[PDB]
Short mmCIF file of C-alpha atoms in Angstrom, two decimals:
data_model
loop_
_atom_site.label_atom_id
_atom_site.label_comp_id
_atom_site.label_asym_id
_atom_site.label_seq_id
_atom_site.Cartn_x
_atom_site.Cartn_y
_atom_site.Cartn_z
CA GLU A 1 210.88 144.81 173.63
CA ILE A 2 208.80 142.27 171.70
CA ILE A 3 205.23 142.74 170.47
CA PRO A 4 203.60 139.38 169.60
CA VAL A 5 201.72 139.07 166.30
CA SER A 6 201.13 135.34 165.82
CA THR A 7 202.84 131.98 166.49
CA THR A 8 205.24 132.63 163.57
CA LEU A 9 205.27 136.45 163.63
CA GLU A 10 206.56 139.06 166.07
CA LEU A 11 207.66 142.68 166.24
CA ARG A 12 211.08 143.61 167.64
CA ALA A 13 212.26 147.11 168.54
CA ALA A 14 215.16 148.08 166.26
CA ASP A 15 218.62 147.54 167.83
CA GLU A 16 222.18 148.55 167.05
CA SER A 17 222.88 144.81 166.53
CA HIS A 18 220.15 144.42 163.87
CA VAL A 19 222.03 146.74 161.48
CA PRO A 20 224.31 144.16 159.72
CA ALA A 21 221.21 142.10 158.69
CA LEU A 22 218.93 145.15 158.10
CA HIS A 23 221.32 146.82 155.65
CA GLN A 24 221.45 143.52 153.71
CA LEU A 25 217.65 143.57 153.47
CA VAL A 26 217.82 147.23 152.30
CA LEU A 27 220.44 146.35 149.65
CA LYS A 28 218.36 143.39 148.46
CA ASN A 29 215.15 145.52 148.13
CA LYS A 30 216.75 148.76 146.85
CA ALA A 31 214.79 148.78 143.57
CA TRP A 32 211.48 148.84 145.50
CA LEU A 33 212.69 151.13 148.34
CA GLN A 34 213.97 153.93 146.08
CA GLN A 35 210.47 154.24 144.51
CA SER A 36 208.76 154.72 147.93
CA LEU A 37 208.57 157.54 150.53
CA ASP A 38 209.26 155.07 153.39
CA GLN A 39 214.33 156.60 150.35
CA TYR A 40 217.99 156.67 149.19
CA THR A 41 224.09 154.00 149.96
CA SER A 42 226.37 152.92 152.83
CA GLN A 43 225.76 150.71 155.89
CA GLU A 44 226.62 153.66 158.15
CA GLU A 45 223.60 155.44 156.67
CA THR A 46 221.43 152.48 157.72
CA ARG A 47 222.87 152.42 161.28
CA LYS A 48 222.45 156.23 161.44
CA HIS A 49 218.69 155.90 160.81
CA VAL A 50 218.47 153.01 163.34
CA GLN A 51 220.38 154.83 166.13
CA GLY A 52 218.39 157.95 165.20
CA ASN A 53 215.10 156.09 165.66
CA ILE A 54 216.15 154.35 168.91
CA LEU A 55 216.57 157.88 170.33
CA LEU A 56 213.10 158.90 169.11
CA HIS A 57 211.73 155.48 170.21
CA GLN A 58 212.89 156.24 173.78
CA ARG A 59 211.78 159.90 173.92
CA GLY A 60 208.40 158.90 172.47
CA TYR A 61 207.91 160.72 169.15
CA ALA A 62 208.76 157.77 166.88
CA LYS A 63 208.89 153.97 166.96
CA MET A 64 210.90 151.54 164.83
CA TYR A 65 210.02 147.85 164.78
CA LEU A 66 211.31 144.97 162.72
CA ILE A 67 209.11 142.12 161.58
CA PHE A 68 210.58 138.74 162.39
CA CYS A 69 209.02 135.71 160.76
CA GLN A 70 210.14 132.39 162.30
CA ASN A 71 213.18 134.25 163.69
CA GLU A 72 213.95 135.82 160.29
CA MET A 73 213.96 139.56 159.58
CA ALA A 74 211.26 140.17 156.97
CA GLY A 75 210.79 143.95 157.03
CA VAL A 76 210.19 147.24 158.83
CA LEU A 77 207.17 148.81 160.55
CA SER A 78 207.41 152.25 162.13
CA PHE A 79 205.63 155.40 163.42
CA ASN A 80 207.47 158.14 161.45
CA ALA A 81 206.32 160.97 163.69
CA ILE A 82 203.98 160.89 166.68
CA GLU A 83 201.70 163.70 167.92
CA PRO A 84 201.21 162.79 171.60
CA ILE A 85 198.36 165.20 172.41
CA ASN A 86 196.55 164.61 169.09
CA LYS A 87 197.25 160.88 169.68
CA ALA A 88 198.18 160.54 166.00
CA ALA A 89 201.04 158.79 164.20
CA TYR A 90 202.32 158.46 160.63
CA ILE A 91 203.14 154.91 159.54
CA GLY A 92 206.20 153.84 157.57
CA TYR A 93 206.57 150.26 156.31
CA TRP A 94 208.08 147.84 153.85
CA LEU A 95 208.52 144.13 153.46
CA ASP A 96 211.34 142.14 151.86
CA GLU A 97 210.17 141.05 148.39
CA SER A 98 210.45 137.30 149.12
CA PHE A 99 208.05 137.77 152.07
CA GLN A 100 205.23 139.47 150.13
CA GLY A 101 201.72 138.11 149.53
CA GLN A 102 201.30 136.29 152.87
CA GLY A 103 199.46 138.93 154.95
CA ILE A 104 202.59 139.44 157.08
CA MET A 105 202.55 143.28 156.95
CA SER A 106 198.80 143.29 157.50
CA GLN A 107 199.03 141.12 160.65
CA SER A 108 201.97 143.21 161.88
CA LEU A 109 200.24 146.54 161.26
CA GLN A 110 196.97 145.38 162.92
CA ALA A 111 198.91 144.10 165.95
CA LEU A 112 200.98 147.29 166.29
CA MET A 113 197.92 149.58 165.95
CA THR A 114 196.00 147.40 168.44
CA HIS A 115 198.91 147.48 170.93
CA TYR A 116 199.14 151.31 170.91
CA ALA A 117 195.38 151.98 170.87
CA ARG A 118 194.65 149.97 174.03
CA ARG A 119 197.49 151.69 175.89
CA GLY A 120 195.83 155.01 174.94
CA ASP A 121 198.91 156.48 173.25
CA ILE A 122 197.65 156.61 169.66
CA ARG A 123 194.18 156.46 168.15
CA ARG A 124 194.71 158.10 164.77
CA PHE A 125 196.93 156.17 162.36
CA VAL A 126 197.93 157.88 159.14
CA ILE A 127 199.47 156.61 155.90
CA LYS A 128 200.95 158.87 153.26
CA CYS A 129 202.04 157.32 149.98
CA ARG A 130 202.68 158.23 146.37
CA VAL A 131 199.53 158.04 144.25
CA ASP A 132 201.50 155.95 141.74
CA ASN A 133 202.89 153.38 144.21
CA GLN A 134 200.43 150.48 143.79
CA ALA A 135 201.89 148.39 146.64
CA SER A 136 201.77 151.20 149.25
CA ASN A 137 198.19 152.17 148.36
CA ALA A 138 197.29 148.46 148.66
CA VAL A 139 198.66 148.24 152.22
CA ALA A 140 196.37 151.16 153.15
CA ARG A 141 193.22 149.86 151.40
CA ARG A 142 193.89 146.27 152.51
CA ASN A 143 194.04 147.35 156.15
CA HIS A 144 190.80 149.32 156.12
CA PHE A 145 192.25 152.85 156.10
CA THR A 146 189.96 155.54 154.74
CA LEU A 147 191.31 157.82 151.97
CA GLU A 148 191.20 161.38 153.40
CA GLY A 149 192.72 163.20 150.44
CA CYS A 150 195.25 163.81 147.72
CA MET A 151 198.10 166.23 148.34
CA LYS A 152 199.31 167.73 145.05
CA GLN A 153 203.08 167.46 144.45
CA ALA A 154 203.60 167.17 148.20
CA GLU A 155 206.81 165.15 148.24
CA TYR A 156 210.15 165.47 146.46
CA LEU A 157 211.82 162.18 145.47
CA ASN A 158 214.34 161.40 142.73
CA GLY A 159 214.33 164.80 141.05
CA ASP A 160 210.55 165.47 140.99
CA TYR A 161 207.47 166.29 143.10
CA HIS A 162 204.85 163.58 143.70
CA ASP A 163 201.14 163.65 144.52
CA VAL A 164 200.58 161.85 147.81
CA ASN A 165 197.44 160.07 149.07
CA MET A 166 196.63 160.45 152.76
CA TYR A 167 194.78 157.62 154.44
CA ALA A 168 193.76 157.31 158.08
CA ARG A 169 192.28 154.80 160.53
CA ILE A 170 190.74 155.79 163.90
CA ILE A 171 190.86 153.23 166.75
CA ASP A 172 189.29 154.56 169.97
CA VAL B 1 215.59 194.14 159.92
CA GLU B 2 213.66 191.70 157.76
CA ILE B 3 210.55 193.44 156.44
CA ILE B 4 208.27 192.09 153.71
CA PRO B 5 206.21 194.97 152.23
CA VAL B 6 202.45 194.39 151.81
CA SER B 7 200.92 197.84 151.19
CA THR B 8 201.48 201.51 152.15
CA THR B 9 199.40 200.54 155.19
CA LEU B 10 200.70 197.04 155.83
CA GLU B 11 204.01 195.25 156.28
CA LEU B 12 205.36 192.00 157.74
CA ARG B 13 208.21 192.27 160.24
CA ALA B 14 210.22 189.22 161.28
CA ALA B 15 209.49 188.59 164.97
CA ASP B 16 212.30 189.63 167.32
CA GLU B 17 212.89 189.68 171.10
CA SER B 18 211.67 193.27 171.44
CA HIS B 19 208.22 192.42 170.07
CA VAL B 20 207.42 190.07 172.97
CA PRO B 21 205.88 192.70 175.35
CA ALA B 22 203.29 194.06 172.84
CA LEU B 23 202.74 190.55 171.45
CA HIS B 24 201.93 189.11 174.87
CA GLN B 25 199.45 191.97 175.43
CA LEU B 26 197.79 191.25 172.08
CA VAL B 27 197.47 187.58 173.09
CA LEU B 28 195.80 188.58 176.39
CA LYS B 29 193.48 190.99 174.62
CA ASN B 30 192.35 188.22 172.24
CA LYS B 31 192.33 185.31 174.72
CA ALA B 32 188.60 184.46 174.36
CA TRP B 33 188.58 183.48 170.67
CA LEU B 34 192.27 182.45 170.44
CA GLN B 35 191.12 179.62 172.74
CA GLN B 36 189.42 177.94 169.75
CA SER B 37 192.34 178.60 167.39
CA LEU B 38 194.90 176.04 166.22
CA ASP B 39 197.36 178.91 165.56
CA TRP B 40 198.47 179.98 169.01
CA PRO B 41 199.36 177.32 171.56
CA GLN B 42 196.77 177.51 174.35
CA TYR B 43 199.25 176.59 177.09
CA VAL B 44 201.34 179.72 176.51
CA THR B 45 199.79 182.62 178.39
CA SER B 46 202.40 184.16 180.69
CA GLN B 47 204.77 186.75 179.21
CA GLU B 48 207.55 184.23 179.85
CA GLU B 49 205.78 181.41 178.03
CA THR B 50 205.42 183.88 175.14
CA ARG B 51 209.10 184.90 175.10
CA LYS B 52 210.23 181.27 175.11
CA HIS B 53 207.81 180.65 172.25
CA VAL B 54 209.12 183.63 170.24
CA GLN B 55 212.81 182.82 171.03
CA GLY B 56 212.23 179.27 169.78
CA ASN B 57 210.61 180.53 166.57
CA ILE B 58 213.23 183.24 165.85
CA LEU B 59 215.71 180.37 165.71
CA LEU B 60 213.56 178.21 163.41
CA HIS B 61 213.05 181.33 161.24
CA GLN B 62 216.81 181.96 160.96
CA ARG B 63 217.45 178.29 160.05
CA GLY B 64 214.52 178.18 157.60
CA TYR B 65 212.41 175.54 159.35
CA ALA B 66 209.59 177.99 160.11
CA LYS B 67 208.83 181.71 159.78
CA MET B 68 207.22 184.11 162.25
CA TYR B 69 206.12 187.52 160.97
CA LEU B 70 204.24 190.18 162.85
CA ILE B 71 201.70 192.12 160.83
CA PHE B 72 202.01 195.88 161.24
CA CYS B 73 199.25 198.25 160.26
CA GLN B 74 200.45 201.88 160.28
CA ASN B 75 203.07 201.07 162.93
CA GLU B 76 200.61 199.16 165.16
CA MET B 77 200.97 195.39 165.78
CA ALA B 78 197.86 193.78 164.23
CA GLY B 79 198.51 190.04 164.33
CA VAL B 80 200.84 187.17 163.44
CA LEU B 81 201.48 185.40 160.13
CA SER B 82 203.59 182.27 160.27
CA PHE B 83 204.88 179.26 158.47
CA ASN B 84 204.27 176.82 161.33
CA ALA B 85 206.66 174.48 159.57
CA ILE B 86 208.71 174.40 156.35
CA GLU B 87 209.90 171.20 154.65
CA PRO B 88 212.92 172.41 152.61
CA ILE B 89 213.26 169.12 150.68
CA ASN B 90 209.58 169.43 149.53
CA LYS B 91 209.54 173.24 149.27
CA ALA B 92 206.31 173.07 151.28
CA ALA B 93 205.14 175.28 154.15
CA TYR B 94 202.16 175.19 156.53
CA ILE B 95 200.57 178.57 157.16
CA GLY B 96 199.30 179.79 160.53
CA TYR B 97 197.93 183.22 161.43
CA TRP B 98 195.65 185.28 163.62
CA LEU B 99 194.54 188.93 163.79
CA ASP B 100 193.56 191.10 166.70
CA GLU B 101 189.73 191.48 166.68
CA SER B 102 189.89 195.19 165.76
CA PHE B 103 191.87 194.47 162.58
CA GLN B 104 189.49 191.76 161.34
CA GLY B 105 187.15 191.86 158.34
CA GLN B 106 189.36 194.39 156.52
CA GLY B 107 191.18 192.21 153.96
CA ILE B 108 194.43 192.33 155.99
CA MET B 109 195.02 188.54 155.90
CA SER B 110 194.21 188.31 152.19
CA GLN B 111 196.77 191.00 151.40
CA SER B 112 199.34 189.65 153.88
CA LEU B 113 198.96 186.07 152.56
CA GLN B 114 199.30 187.09 148.91
CA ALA B 115 202.40 189.15 149.70
CA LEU B 116 204.03 186.35 151.78
CA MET B 117 203.40 183.58 149.18
CA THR B 118 204.56 185.77 146.27
CA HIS B 119 207.73 186.71 148.16
CA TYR B 120 208.56 183.06 148.87
CA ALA B 121 207.47 181.67 145.49
CA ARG B 122 209.14 184.30 143.31
CA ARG B 123 212.49 183.19 144.68
CA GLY B 124 211.59 179.51 144.28
CA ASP B 125 212.26 178.24 147.81
CA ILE B 126 208.64 177.52 148.71
CA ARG B 127 206.19 176.41 146.03
CA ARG B 128 203.53 174.56 148.03
CA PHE B 129 201.52 176.45 150.66
CA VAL B 130 199.18 174.61 152.98
CA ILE B 131 196.43 175.72 155.31
CA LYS B 132 195.05 173.27 157.86
CA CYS B 133 192.01 174.51 159.72
CA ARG B 134 189.10 173.10 161.73
CA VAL B 135 186.08 172.15 159.59
CA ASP B 136 183.88 174.12 162.00
CA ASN B 137 185.89 177.36 161.67
CA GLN B 138 183.90 179.32 159.09
CA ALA B 139 186.29 182.30 158.95
CA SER B 140 189.38 180.11 158.49
CA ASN B 141 187.72 178.11 155.69
CA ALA B 142 186.60 181.35 153.96
CA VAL B 143 190.13 182.82 154.07
CA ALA B 144 191.50 179.69 152.31
CA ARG B 145 188.75 179.95 149.65
CA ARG B 146 189.38 183.69 149.00
CA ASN B 147 193.11 183.14 148.59
CA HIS B 148 193.12 180.54 145.80
CA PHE B 149 193.62 177.46 147.96
CA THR B 150 192.15 174.13 146.86
CA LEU B 151 190.64 171.74 149.40
CA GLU B 152 192.78 168.58 149.24
CA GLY B 153 191.06 166.61 151.98
CA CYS B 154 189.49 166.29 155.39
CA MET B 155 191.47 164.80 158.27
CA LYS B 156 189.12 163.03 160.73
CA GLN B 157 189.69 163.90 164.41
CA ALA B 158 193.16 165.17 163.54
CA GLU B 159 193.45 167.84 166.21
CA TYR B 160 192.90 167.76 169.97
CA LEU B 161 191.65 171.01 171.43
CA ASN B 162 189.51 171.81 174.48
CA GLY B 163 188.69 168.22 175.48
CA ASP B 164 187.83 166.88 172.01
CA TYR B 165 189.24 165.66 168.65
CA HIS B 166 188.36 167.87 165.67
CA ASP B 167 188.08 167.26 161.94
CA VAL B 168 190.39 169.50 159.93
CA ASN B 169 190.31 170.55 156.28
CA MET B 170 193.59 170.64 154.39
CA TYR B 171 193.96 173.26 151.68
CA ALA B 172 196.89 173.80 149.34
CA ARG B 173 198.16 176.18 146.71
CA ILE B 174 201.07 175.54 144.29
CA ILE B 175 202.93 178.63 143.01
CA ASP B 176 205.47 177.94 140.19
#
């Protein structure tokens, strides 16, 4: 399963075989990843999450895609949870540091939202991120999500509770 | 038996199999306005849909991923007070409830909510309590305001019910 983005960009459904290269991306970006809700070791842990999401990807309450830029794995774009009757989904994402600042995540997100909206599966796209994560809040604001609120101490990470912004975008 | 005391009049009893009969009858009795509620699924009507719903929730309750309490007023079943979901890692829970029409406007939810939150907060396993309700539900919004919840935001078209997508207010309270 491929979802086209541009002539250099595409979205690929996460595979078992992607794991060796994905875990390397995770290791390489660990300093950024451990500060974001999108969270914590071994390669088996990475394959666990991938196999876990393939199962959800099939049965329809999550999706896990990988951004490939000129046939190179650049990052991760997913629907964390999916509410099929509400037609809502929560978005998880991150990009490899060396790929930042090109509009890659933005083009990927817009393409993935567009794909799912015109098939009628999802119309409400939600982002939750730490108030203090500048990069995550930028992805939301940069992609025309509306800030719906601020959830006080909503998420535990690294020994403390964090305020979380909720953003949403409706595409009918 | 798990019982959380509320008053000399009120208590919360963990839902069990044997409650299903009277619960189903209370659902039927209150079908008209429950139809607008987010807090009872509107595709569970038959006594067997209800049992499967309660059996599912008894299991979530035991594991700590939800709670389902029945409100008892002088030995009569008055309504339901739930944590629709619990996130153990966040110590956060989403509250759902409804009362039979004849037990409404008496302060029963206020008392039951204060008792539930205190019970869970005192022990330190849930600190963040959340109410999501439709913007257009005046009673639900009032209950959140009387019970020391703060409006955190408004989710546009978050909830599909009766042919349409509805805006929902999110309220929270932190205890501890």
